[PDB]
Each structure stands twice: as structure tokens, then as C-alpha cells.
Amino acid sequence: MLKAGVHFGHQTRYWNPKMKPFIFGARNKVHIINLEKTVPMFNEALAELNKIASRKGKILFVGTKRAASEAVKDAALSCDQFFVNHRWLGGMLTNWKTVRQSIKRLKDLETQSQDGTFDKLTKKEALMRTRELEKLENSLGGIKDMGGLPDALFVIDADHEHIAIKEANNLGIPVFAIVDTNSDPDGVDFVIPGNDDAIRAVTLYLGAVAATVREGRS
Amino acid sequence: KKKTTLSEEDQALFRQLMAGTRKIKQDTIVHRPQRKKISEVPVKRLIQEQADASHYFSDEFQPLLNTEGPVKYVRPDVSHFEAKKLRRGDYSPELFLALAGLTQLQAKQELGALIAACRREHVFCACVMHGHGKHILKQQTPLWLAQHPHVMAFHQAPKEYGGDAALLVLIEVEE
Amino acid sequence: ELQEKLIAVNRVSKTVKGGRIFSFTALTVVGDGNGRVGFGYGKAREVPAAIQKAMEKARRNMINVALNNGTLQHPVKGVHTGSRVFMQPASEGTGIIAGGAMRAVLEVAGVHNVLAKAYGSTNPINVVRATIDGLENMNSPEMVAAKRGK
RNA sequence: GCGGCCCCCUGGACGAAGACUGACGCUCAGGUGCGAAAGCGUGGGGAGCAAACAGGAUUAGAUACCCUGGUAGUCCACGCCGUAAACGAUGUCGACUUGGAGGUUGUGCCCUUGAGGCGUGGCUUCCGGAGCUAACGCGUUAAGUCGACCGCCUGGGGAGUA
RNA sequence: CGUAAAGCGCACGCAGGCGGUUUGUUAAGUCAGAUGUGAAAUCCCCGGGCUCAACCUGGGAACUGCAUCUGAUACUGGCAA
RNA sequence: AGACCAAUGCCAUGUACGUCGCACUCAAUAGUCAGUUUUCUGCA
């Protein structure tokens, strides 16, 4: 709701002509996003995104670059929602089938880990198995309790996370992206011209989104 | 109607704060994506849901089902009383699936579709009719159903819903 | 009401280290009989696995066609790779009279009585791809009147 | 195709502002001109290089590759020839259609507060979007989207031969 | 017609083909109608006779053309500005 | 970096790729009519 405070746009380099409607674009070789265009765009994204959030849907924040972590873990986990913060595996939506059995192995190995037989029979293989829980835990972290493929997708950079956008367009999932002036509005259904790599901007930004996901009529 | 926003004068002030002349005025044709239908549910999504649901039905894996009596199954963590309720007919199925005459492959797909539909429509109880066969759908289908994570419990259907030729199935739904 | 039919099976080869290895490719088209046409390619090591992968890919990837009463609407030309294809609505111009591998897609497409004549290449894998492209960019009088106002 | 420097005679291109003519334009079969190199004719020149040629090697042989010599030729004047993988293997002229990084040559504006900032032309290089393409790739210098006129193609060989 | 066959080695240019934009006139091309002709048979259509059919046959359509007259003037051409 | 390395009878190659099934039986409701006369029957 609050006016974007401190980002005003970025990316002098590799700017994309399809971002030409969103650029004010003056200072010191770098491009300034027209935030007077961003505010209606971002309010629309909060509108439809709250609309699917009230229908009891799953949202899947996507935060692979740094420092979108742990800001996407903090914002998704502040809601009762899901996230990807480390490397987004190629095909966790379009073959979720195979990713379902990897999530199943993460559940079986944490149940085996903190409760069952973890000290049993070996030290070396037990260390091997625990670092399998680090690898499967940081890759399949947020998505491990989803149990479906989600009803929307909220990516924090459109060019850095083009794979996830390409799959959610492949599957008919609404993509909500904060694009920058280098990115491309591929199949992003609700584009938001913003700043992808400022931590102030993405914490303000995810703060608003996580605010409207759990917003409660009460 | 225009959404509430900072005043135009305020926007101009933001423009004033912008260091330098600080104005970008490139004009280009603008294309806006059509708004998604409220109903949604595109056939492709449905097909995808079906495929996802049927993915669990393996011919190689055989869950241990009770060999004594009418066919029944309860998923670990679900109250055993649910199977009893199915037997007594406490649950009235809202969806009916007829598998009789289908190949195994077709049947798996239809079962997947049924489960997807139950989830989508928040239907908790469905009836699956497989007919009577030896080493056929009548035997293979319960095994496939058990392997599905959304299947909570099933029991031989009461006579009113097909008896020994049908199953009542309880499906886990997000509400 | 699925109405599947196979057009072409071939034996392709690979030429590994020790001799050659022979694989089989199917090419099928399914369709309900009222628009809704799909094709699938599918390739496997034996013929029934190939046709099954082809049907399974063809049941998805299925396209709507805006039919007329039982036929096309206006004459349409679809091209794909080297394969140029003409079609003409033939307002009850009886019987589907199309080339091979075009008769099948037009048959399960639900159209009954058009006139065709494929030109150029007439490889079956590209003469469909030039019938769907074709039937895809054929639009109806309620779509043209939707576009241009009335 | 043109590579030291200088003079003389001379062709074109591009840019800036303004003036003038007023469709005078585009393409072009036959026709005419120019057209690398080798070659030919007449007369010069001839250092290097070098077909031919000779010798030495190498080799089974070596009319070759390698070595040592070496004539025409290459150089100049005038005339002929009239061809090349004469190739961006892409005819000429015009119009339209997202971009990025350079090079080169003009010109305008702004504190020129420097080897700057903002534009606007001409030619050119690399990469790529849509589109096209059998593919490879082309991609505002198109092989995209069109128009005008010309040239040429129609299976391989025989044969670009008689 | 880059690489499959196919862009003259490159230009200049005659005859030829094509030609920005506005107004007026003409009406040659173009279009509309009319008239004369386009033989009959044959093809096509609707009927009729051979027991049916082939066949024969009545009427029409057609013969996509040409010529002349009457108009229309948007485009192309001619002429004037 | 940069010696020297020539040639390799005659044929046809293939069979060969076209797909399925199930069933079943247990019960009501023949016939039965009548039954002397009365009456104390713990108490606060």
C-alpha cells in the first residue's frame, strides 16, 4: 500500500526493449522504472493474488538469488505458504511426479533422522544420510509440505528465474513477477516493474505480498 | 475507476527528487495480456492433474491388503472407524466412476481423473465400479488405489451402490 | 468417442559401435469427430510401444477446429516444412477426397466432405502439421464478425 | 582493383543551411564501354622471383614435393585477349518491419568547467528478435513483408562438348 | 535462383516494361445495358419416344467472342495546367 | 615445427514386427369352544 520508498529502478546493462513502456530512464546511463506505472501494476497483483489467496490456494514464492534468501523463507513462512530459495530444480512443476518421490524421500529421511534409527549400524553412512538431508532440505525446502502443484507462482526475478516462469506458463499457473529493466514479460500474467536485486526493495516488496496473502477479514 | 495512489503533484515531486533531468519519455506500443477467466480449469490443467494423480498407480508394487473378508483399506494415520462407516453406508458417494470394460491403462487414467476431480470439487466420498473379474480390474484397482496418497480409506460398497462389484472410496480434500 | 487411427509406421536406424540399431516410429492422429484433432509421433524399439506412445502423445496436444455443418468453411492453405496443402470446403462435395495422411486427419477431425490436394513434399509427418496448420487458422463467420465489429 | 613522399590534370561520395528546376524517374533485351592473372604482337628493360629446362637427392619408380642453378614471364609504352572460387557462390531501384556492441567520416546543442553529456546524417563489422528457410543460417546492409524491370533454371552423364 | 539446376564480371544506355501528387477535359483500356452475329449437330439442363439403356428427339442454356450504338468515369492511358 | 607409409577379387545382406476374457442359490398365512356362588383378608 505504501509508496515504493527506495529502489527507483536499475540495470544500465542488457536492458530489454519490451520494458520500454515501464521506463522513465534518465540518470547516469542507468534506467529508472516509472513507479507511477508500478503502483497500479503492483496493486493489481495484490488484488488478484489476494483473490486466489482467499480461495485457499498455494502460492510458491521463488527466491533463488541472494539476498532473496532468507527473505522468501521469512515471507513465505510468515504465511502458511511455500517457497524455493536455493536452486530451483529444472522441472519441479512440469514433472512434479518425480519430484513427488524426492519429497517423499525427504519426509522419510527426516522421520528416520530426528526420531528413528539414525545412530544405527554406521557412522559414515549416517553422516552420508544426514548430508542427504542437507541437500534435499535446501533444494526441496518449502515445497516439501505442498502436496499439490500450486495455484499461483510469485517469482522475484524474471530473467534469473526464467525456468520457473516457463513451466508455470507451460502448466497454466498465474505468474506474478517483479521484472527489472533487463527482464522480459514472457508469460508473466501480472508483471510488476520493479527492482529485483535490492534487499530493501524485495523486503518491502515481499512484505506487501506476504501481508496480502494472510490478510484476514476476521 | 482509478485506484488510490500518490497525488500527481507528489509524483511530480518524486520526479523532482530524481537527480538530473531525470525524465524518460520513450513511447512504444503496449500490449496487455487478456485477463484470466474466473472459472479457469483449462482442459490442459485438468489433463495435467489427471496425469499427476494416475502417476501413483504402479503395477509392480502390491500393497498388503487384508485377505480375509470384503476388500478394505485404511491409510496409515487415518481412523480405522472410517472403513467401518464406509461398510455401514454412512458415506454417500457424490461421484461415480464406472471402470467396467476398460483396459488397465484406461482405468488408471480414469481413476486418476476421478481423484483429481474429487480434490478439485471437494468431494470426499466416491464410488468406483469395476465389475467382477479374476486377475482383472476387480483385483488390480484396489491395489492401485491404496498406493495413492489422497486415498484415505475404501471398502466394498454396500448393495445399494454395486456390492462386490464396486468400492466406496474416501478421498482426502484440503477442507 | 475417441476415434484414433494410425497413419505411418517406419523403421529408422542409429548406427552404433557394433552394427546398427533399428527403432520404429509411429504417427497417429486422434480426434472426437467434432473439431478436436490431435497428432502424435512417438518412437520406440518395437511397433506396439511406438503406437502406444504416439496415441498417448496425441490424446493430449489436441486442437480445436471451427467446423461448419459437416465440413470446412472457406478454402484454406496450410504449409509446413516442405509440404504445402490446399483445402476447399466443398459444401457437401461428397466424401472426404484428400491425399494419404490427410484423409486420416480430416477423417477423425469430424469433417466429411472436403476437397484437398497436397502439393510440394508429401511426407506424412509434415502433411499433417500442414493440415492442422490449416484447420487451426481457419476461422468461422462468428469469429470474423467478432473481430471486425459486424 | 588501388599502399613511400611531392607536384600537375581529373572523377565520385558525404555533410550544413539556403536557393532553384519542377517528375526531368526506375529497370533494360540487342548495343557500347570498363574488366585480376596468365597469354599474344611490336619496341624497350631485366635487380629479385621464377613456369620450361638442367643437375643433386628422395623413391620401387619420381617426368613431383625438397636442394642448386635457371629462360620466357613478372616491369615500362602502345595494341590485343576477354576470362577467374571475376564470390557477400546473394541483379538493380524503391518502401515498410523489435534490438545490442563496435569502427569510420560529417554536423548541431549544452558549464568545453578534460581524454565529456545529448542529438542528427553517410558508409561499414559482429551478435541476435519476429519472420523466413530443407536445414545450415539470413536477420533494418534480409535469405522478413511488398512493388517495378531485367538475367537465368528444369534429373545425372554425354557437355558447356561437337 | 546463398549452399540442391539457376543472379550476366561490372556498369552506361537505345527500343521495350513500369511510373510521385492535384485539378480540369477526353473515354482509348475498364465497366453496364442494348442490337446484329457467334450455322446445325455435340457438351449441359428440363421434358418426350424406342419394354429400359445406348440411341433418337422438343424447348432452353451455352458458344466464355467480335462489331456497332447508348451510357458510367473510380482506376489505367491521352491532352492541358 | 617441417624424414619417409603404395595397395586392399566378385556378389545378395536379411527375417522383422499386425494383438484378448469372466461367473453364480435365503422367508409368512391349518384348526383351540368354555371355565357354579360369595367373602374376612395386619395398620397408624
d(CA A180, CA A15): 9
Helices (H) then strands (E): counts for chain A: 6, 5
Q: Single out the residue of A184, A179, A190 nearest to residue A17, CA to CA.
A: A184
Q: How was this structure determined?
A: cryo-EM
d(CA C95, CA C81): 28
What phi and psi, each to the nearest 5 degrees, are found at residue A112?
A: -65, -30
C-alpha cell at A19: 520494458
Q: Which nucleotides of D are covered by protein (CB under 7 A)?
A: 98-100, 118, 133-135
Q: How deeply is B1 buried, as exposed, middle or buried, from its count of CB atoms within 10 A (0-12, 13-18, 19+)?
A: exposed
Q: How deeply is A46 buried, as exposed, middle or buried, from its count of CB atoms within 10 A (0-12, 13-18, 19+)?
A: buried
d(CA B55, CA A168): 20
Q: Single out the residue of B167, B119, B120, B175 nearest to residue B144, CA to CA.
A: B167
d(CA B98, CA B162): 11
**Interface residues of chain B, partner chain A, Cβ below 8 Å:** 2-3, 5-6, 11, 14-15, 18-26, 28, 30, 33, 36, 40, 42, 44-45, 48, 51-52, 55, 119, 149, 174-175
Report in angstroms the alpha-carbon separations of C86 from C35, C120, C141: 18, 11, 20
User: A167 Cβ partners below 8 Å, 6+ apart?
Assistant: A91, A93, A94, A173
DSSP calls for chain C: ---EEE---EEEE---SSS--EEEE--EEEE-SSS-EEEE--EESSHHHHHHHHHHHHHSSEE-----SSS-SS-EEEE-SSEEEEEB--TT-SS-B--TTTHHHHHHTT--S-B--EEE---HHHHSSSSHHHHTT---HHHHHHHT--
Min distance A168 CA to chain B CA atoms (Å) = 11
B22 contacts in chain A (CB < 8 Å): 24, 26-27, 32
Protein CA at B95 to nucleotide C1' at F36, angstroms: 78
Q: Single out the residue of C79, C90, C86 nearest to residue C126, CA to CA.
A: C79
DSSP single-letter state for residue A95? T
Is there a contact between C28 and C44 (Cβ–Cβ < 8 Å)?
A: no
Is there a contact between C89 and C72 (Cβ–Cβ < 8 Å)?
A: yes
d(CA C35, CA B42): 17
In the three-class reduction of DSSP (H, G, I as helix; E, B as strand; rest coil), residue A9 is classed as coil
Task: List residues, Cβ < 7 Å, touching strand D.
Answer: A 15, 17, 20, 29; B 28; C 79, 81-82
Is there a contact between C73 and C89 (Cβ–Cβ < 8 Å)?
A: yes
In the three-class reduction of DSSP (H, G, I as helix; E, B as strand; rest coil), residue B153 is classed as strand
C-alpha cell at C2: 475417441
Segment (H or E) for B43: helix B43-54
Q: Single out the residue of A151, A155, A153 nearest to residue A194, CA to CA.
A: A155
Q: Which nucleotides of F are covered by protein (CB under 7 A)?
A: 14, 16-19, 21-24
Q: How deeply is C12 buried, as exposed, middle or buried, from its count of CB atoms within 10 A (0-12, 13-18, 19+)?
A: exposed
C-alpha cell at C81: 516444412
Is there a contact between B126 and B93 (Cβ–Cβ < 8 Å)?
A: yes
Q: Single out the residue of C53, C68, C54 nearest to residue C125, CA to CA.
A: C54
Residue B19, number of CB atoms within 10 A of its CB: 10
C-alpha cell at C78: 496450410
d(CA C109, CA C135): 9
Is there a contact between B102 and B137 (Cβ–Cβ < 8 Å)?
A: yes
C-alpha cell at A163: 525456468
Long-range contacts of A133-141 (CB under 8 A, 24+ apart): A133/A106, A133/A109, A136/A102, A136/A105, A136/A106, A136/A109, A137/A106, A137/A110, A138/A85, A138/A86, A139/A86, A139/A87, A139/A89, A140/A89, A140/A92, A140/A99, A140/A102, A140/A103, A140/A106, A141/A73, A141/A83, A141/A84, A141/A85, A141/A86
Q: Of B18, B42, B174, which is closest to A56 when you measure between CB atoms?
A: B174
Residue B170 Rama label (left phi>0; alpha psi -120 to 50; beta): beta
d(CA A89, CA A105): 16
| Residue matched to cell numbers 542437507 | A134
Strand partners, C37: C31, C63
Gapped junctions in chain B, after residues (C–N > 2.5 Å): none
B and A interact (at least 3 Cβ pairs within 8 A): yes
A31 contacts in chain B (CB < 8 Å): 24
C-alpha cell at B55: 502417476
Residue type, A158: A
What is the 3-class SS of A107-160, one letter each residue? HHHHHHHHCCCCCCCCCHHHHHHHHHHHHHHHHCCHHHHCCCCCCCEEECCCCC
Q: Single out the residue of A180, C124, C103, A29 nearest to residue B24, CA to CA.
A: A29
Handedness of CA A190, A194, A198, A202 (dihedral sign): negative
C-alpha cell at C64: 480445436
What b/e sequence results for B25-64 when a residue is b if at least 16 CB atoms lie within 10 Å of its CB, and e otherwise?
eeeeeeeeeeeeeeeeeeeebebbbbbbbbbbbeeeeeee
Is there a contact between B131 and B100 (Cβ–Cβ < 8 Å)?
A: yes
Segment (H or E) for B155: strand B151-156
Q: How deeply is B175 buried, as exposed, middle or buried, from its count of CB atoms within 10 A (0-12, 13-18, 19+)?
A: exposed
d(CA B64, CA B28): 65
What b/e sequence results for A131-166 when a residue is b if at least 16 CB atoms lie within 10 Å of its CB, and e otherwise?
eebeebbebbbbbbebeebbbbbbbbbbbbbebbbe
Resolution of this structure in Å: 5.7
Handedness of CA A151, A155, A161, A165 (dihedral sign): positive
Nearest CA in chain A to B119: A148
d(CA A124, CA A116): 17
User: B13 Cβ partners below 8 Å, 6+ apart?
Assistant: none
C-alpha cell at B137: 480390474
Is there a contact between C110 and C36 (Cβ–Cβ < 8 Å)?
A: yes
Min distance B55 CA to chain A CA atoms (Å) = 7
Strand partners, C43: C25
Min distance A148 CA to chain B CA atoms (Å) = 9
In the three-class reduction of DSSP (H, G, I as helix; E, B as strand; rest coil), residue A83 is classed as strand
What phi and psi, each to the nearest 5 degrees, are found at residue B155?
A: -145, 155
| Residue matched to cell numbers 505411418 | C8
Is there a contact between A121 and A132 (Cβ–Cβ < 8 Å)?
A: no
B51 contacts in chain A (CB < 8 Å): 97
